[PDB]
């Protein structure tokens, strides 16, 4: 298939009930990698951080791997759509796609 | 058409463009239940917004959505806007474009997110972000002058000559009425009265609004305050206690004039205005001095213009007469400028549109406007 | 009637034949908005011409259409001409022939294009290009002599005998009132006052026109300038700021006499007048010295004639007595020569017709007139 | 041969003539206690001068003795000089003549007072006032050329041919490194970071010295600034707070090239250098372009010479190749000229004696030297 990027694990599609919590995560194998999260093709999730959306970054020393997490709580209709995860490397850029759905 | 919202500290003023008075005036405070409880017969009412909060002020812990022209929490602001559009305006956001007024040299993030929420949260065909000094100039009805913009949040200076702005000449000042309120509460403690609560914080501000007046000369009144008789007045509080204030009330507004009491090296409002004029071109300086306009929440007190007039006349050359115009209802002047600004046909073409936002992105705000 | 317009650096003179004082005098400047303006209610007016520019001078970036007697941009000139015929004059180009005045040894393109714009952009049956030295001679009322022409643009000398011309004998001098203004601004900087703006450039020129006067001797007053009591005067700017000058004001006119201050190899006005006379034959020299005529913008200051008379008498042969005539209002004398020149019936036959331009071309200007 | 002092903005460099590195480098700033102290056991040190001020920077209010090449307070300067002769140089002013470096077309009061303080405040048998452009000319080892002298304080251009000078051709530029720092602080505010204090003013300058660099082309990097990644860097303040900048850092140096951001009509450094050359004779123009010399505090950033080379090559005639020499340690090059100038035998005769000042007076400076 396509060339290998910096995502060891690509984000996975998820389903969430009303008032629930949903977490999406991506692993990067190794300056530390920079991660951007998007709604649609050009909408930045980072500018949307607040009560309903949080970003968490962590590092695992043993495997030289960075864990990036997206935290969604008290999800509402407005958040339904397509989300794109972009992670950059020291010399490369990579892209992945996933969907968030919240009904009722 | 335009819906006009003045986002100033403490009060949220909303209305319709072209109108001479805003439809909705309420505090911009959001109150939450500080104390936990278990009672049967309450809907709990976790979030309180508007004047309702003022009534239920003691239990509720007030939080200001906007600090120093910067919004700490975006969804609180949405509640404020939701409250303004439906509770008193009784109109739909869909019906008209919305005009928002923002202070000079404000951070990039505030304009981009504010437009982003307006395009996404409330669907409007177009929106525009305007600067408060320009709007005040239109309320004034004059094509040239120097504008003193001092709202509850931050004091700004923006000189103008026959239109055609001078960005370098625009200076931002860290002095404000809200700051005076903090100075005032700090000054009360030495006397023997202490207020450390947000709810009672407003009360000293209230005292300042009607019991405070501008001294023609600070040093002379302060000197005669030793033997005060007519300088002291009695104020009534919800607290159940009576407060008598003297030289303390007029020295609070003074800090705008004398930043030293606050603890800042920056010069006072009269010196800063002079500095703004010095920055400007020599040819346009002459009508700048006689065209000075005062606006905002803390410019309400009588005698401000009288003290400014002599101080500006003293520091400035005597070759030209110094006239300062400070008409009543100047508090709502910023809002008024917004309503007049949106009214003209040329302006409507200029509004940032939803189609443009989605196609190009948030970065277009700087590109389209100042 | 006829229309006479003076064009060529700093000012545009517009008027009617039959009048010794023109209807419209304004600077030849075009103002554009240097700073973009973000406001509502302005017509924007992206183009200012004339005295309006003078009022809105600080914001506008002034540009001179004419540099060193040469026009950099042709459409700016068209706006100026349009402005003179339509606004102040209130006349139609169709109604009368139009007279234009031009200095000697000026480049071909200025005569050809200027006629071309008059023939094409402003349709007229005929037009003529006249030279300042010949018109001054007619004003004088003498058919033989040598004319020293120094005014706006470039100083020129053109001797004539009984109507016959001597092209070799004609001398061009790179001195002008405008040049003095540049000298003056340059001299002000050493004293600690700096003007680098076109708008304030005029202000020093204004100073020079009434404050500056001609000393009997440059060296003695400059020497006595060490302790200046009455040599210093206070001038009031539109700004309201105060400027005091001393030996500085009288040394400005001096530069025409002493170009070394300007930084140019070429000799002063008295040496150049002498050089022009030397080129001419000895037989005609005798009435050349007694018939010297001074006219132009920079010849305004009193005592110029007295200094020139003594310097010319000293340097020149003592064979003949030296007489110089310099009457008041010499600044507009060149324009006056034009208005009178158009008045004569004989002159009307002589104008360069539109039909002739189209049939033969721009190159016939030299052919028709010397 | 004696002592050389560089009095540029921000830093005061002092040392001994004939040395390739000065003995004392410290800021010119004087710090005073902003707040009244409430402590017992302090000498209450009212005035702090030098690097001591840098250590105690937060409480102290820093005032610059020199503004735009002009000293606002004369006694502060005396403390600076007293500090330089005794604290680091450890020599007596009486022992050797003192050489001070002054920029061209500097105001008259600065030369007369500077000499007056040196003759009266400190005892010295002789002193001389030198011009930076000529000193750099000797340092470079060339008799003919054009010198671009830009110090931390002020930028000047002075062309020279075989020992002869052209005052008209000498132009003073209002651009300086200190100005860039002010532009920079002004630019930071829109991003959400605000600095209005003198103490933290230096911190942005520190950022500029290593973080800032010069782009081959301003417009292309700014265009790619939208998607910044490598453009933004993190700077550490004394406080521990973190500042991140992007296109903001390289645009600041640009204003030298493009003054329009500052808000001034006058053209940038490449246009001004060109203007100086145009004034000069065509014959001497050919080696002026290839002999351009850059010196001073603000010429430090890499790529300045490369950007200047194409811009000068583009605007200037192609009749001769354009060569620019920009050696390392250019900041201290001006100082070097002062030390070398003192060294020549001819120069010592030229020093203005203490005896001559007392008899003839302060006005002899123009008489005695250029």
Apparent shape of chain A: globular
Q: Strand-and-helix sequence of chain A, N→C?
A: EEEEEEEEE
Radius of gyration of chain B: 22 Å
| Largest inter-chain contact set | B-C, 28 and 23 residues
Helicity level of chain A:
under 10%
The value of Rg of chain A in angstroms is 14 Å
- Specify the structural class of chain A: mainly beta
Give the CA-CA distance, first to last residue of chain B. 21 Å
Please indicate the percent range of residues of chain A in DSSP E strands (runs of 2 or more): over 45%
Strands ordered across the widest β-sheet of chain A: 2-9-8-4-5
What is the CA-CA span between the terminal residues of chain A? 38 Å
Q: Into which percentage range does the β-strand content of chain B fall?
A: 15-25%
Kindly state the number of beta strands of chain A: 9
Strand order of the largest sheet of chain B: 3-2-1-9-10-18
Largest sheet descriptor of chain B:
6 strands, mixed
The structural class of chain B is alpha+beta
User: Roughly how much helix do the residues of chain B carry, as a percent range?
Assistant: 25-40%
PDB class: motor protein
Keywords: myosin binding protein C, motor protein
Entry title: Cardiac thin filament decorated with C0C1 fragment of cardiac myosin binding protein C mode 1
Chain A: Myosin-binding protein C, cardiac-type
Search tags:
part of a larger assembly, 4 chains, A: 104 residues, mainly beta, five-stranded mixed sheet, four-stranded antiparallel sheet, 0% helix, globular, B: 370 residues, alpha+beta, six-stranded mixed sheet, profilin binding (chains B, C, D), ubiquitin protein ligase binding (chains B, C, D)
Tell me what you see in this structure.
Chain A: This is Myosin-binding protein C, cardiac-type. Chain A: Belongs to the immunoglobulin superfamily. MyBP family. The structure is cut from a larger assembly and holds 1 copy of chain A (104 residues) and 3 copies of chain B (370 residues). By secondary structure, chain A is an all-beta fold. Chain A contains no helices and 9 strands. A 5-stranded mixed sheet of chain A has the order 2-9-8-4-5, with no helix packed on it. In chain A, strands 1-3-7-6 form a 4-stranded antiparallel sheet, with no helix packed on it. In chain A, strand 8 (81-88) and strand 9 form a beta hairpin. In chain A, 17% of the residues are buried. Chain B is α+β, with helices and mostly antiparallel strands and 370 residues long. Helix content of chain B is 39%, strand content 19%. Chain B has helices at 51-55, 74-88, 108-120, 132-140, 177-191, 198-211, 218-224, 247-257, 269-279, 285-289, 304-315, 333-343, 345-350, 354-360, 364-368, and strands spanning 3-7, 11-16, 24-27, 30-33, 48-49, 60-63, 66-67, 70-71, 98-102, 126-131, 145-150, 155-160, 171-173, 233-236, 242-245, 292-295, 324-325, 352-353. In chain B, helix 4 (132-140) packs across helix 12. The two termini of chain B are 21 Å apart. Classes of the chains: A mainly beta (104), B alpha+beta (370). Chains in contact: A-B, B-C, B-D, C-D. Chains B and D meet through loops of B and helix 5 of D.
């Amino acid at each position: 298939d396509d060339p290998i990027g910096l995502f060891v694990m690509r984000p996975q599609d998820g389903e969430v009930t009303v008032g629930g919590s949903i977490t999406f995560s991506a692993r990067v194998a190794g300056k530390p990698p920079v991660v951007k999260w998007f709604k649609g093709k050009w909408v930045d999730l980072s500018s949307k951080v607040g009560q309903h959306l949080q970003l968490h970054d962590s590092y695992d020393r043993a495997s030289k791997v960075y864990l990036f997490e997206l935290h969604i709580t008290d999800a509402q209709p407005a958040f339904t759509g397509s989300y794109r995860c972009e992670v950059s490397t020291k010399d490369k850029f990579d892209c992945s796609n996933f969907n968030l759905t919240v009904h009722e | 058409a335009a819906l006009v919202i003045d986002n100033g500290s403490g009060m949220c003023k909303a209305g319709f463009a072209g109108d001479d008075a805003p439809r909705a005036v309420f505090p911009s405070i959001v109150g939450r239940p500080r104390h936990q409880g278990v009672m049967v017969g309450m809907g709990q009412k976790d979030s309180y917004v508007g004047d309702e909060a003022q009534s239920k002020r003691g239990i509720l812990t007030l939080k200001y959505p906007i600090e120093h022209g910067i919004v700490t929490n975006w969804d609180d602001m949405e509640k404020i806007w939701h409250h303004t559009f439906y509770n008193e305006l009784r109109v739909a956001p869909e019906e008209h474009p919305v005009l928002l007024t923002e202070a000079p040299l404000n951070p990039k993030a505030n304009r981009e997110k504010m437009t982003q929420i307006m395009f996404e949260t409330f669907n409007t065909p177009a929106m525009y972000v305007a600067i408060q000094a320009v709007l005040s100039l239109y309320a004034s009805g004059r094509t040239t002058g120097i504008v003193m913009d001092s709202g509850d949040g931050v004091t700004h200076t923006v000189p103008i000559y026959e239109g055609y702005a001078l960005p370098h000449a625009i200076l931002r000042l860290d002095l404000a009425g809200r700051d005076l309120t903090d100075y005032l509460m700090k000054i009360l403690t030495e006397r023997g009265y202490s207020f450390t609560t947000t709810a009672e914080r407003e009360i000293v501000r209230d005292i300042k609004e009607k019991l405070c007046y501008v001294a023609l000369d600070f040093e002379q009144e302060m000197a005669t305050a030793a033997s005060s008789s007519s300088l002291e007045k009695s104020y009534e509080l919800p607290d159940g206690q009576v407060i008598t204030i003297g030289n303390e009330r007029f020295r609070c507004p003074e800090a705008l004039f004398q930043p030293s009491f606050l603890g800042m090296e920056s010069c006072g409002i009269h010196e800063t205005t002079f500095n703004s004029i010095m920055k400007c071109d020599v040819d346009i300086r002459k009508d700048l001095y006689a065209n000075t306009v005062l606006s905002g929440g803390t410019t309400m007190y009588p005698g401000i213009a009288d003290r400014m007039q002599k101080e500006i006349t003293a520091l400035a050359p005597s070759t030209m007469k110094i006239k300062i115009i400070a008409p009543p209802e100047r508090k709502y002047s910023v809002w008024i400028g917004g309503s007049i600004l949106a009214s003209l046909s040329t302006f409507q073409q200029m509004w940032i549109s939803k189609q443009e936002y989605d196609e190009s992105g948030p970065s277009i705000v700087h590109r389209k406007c100042f």
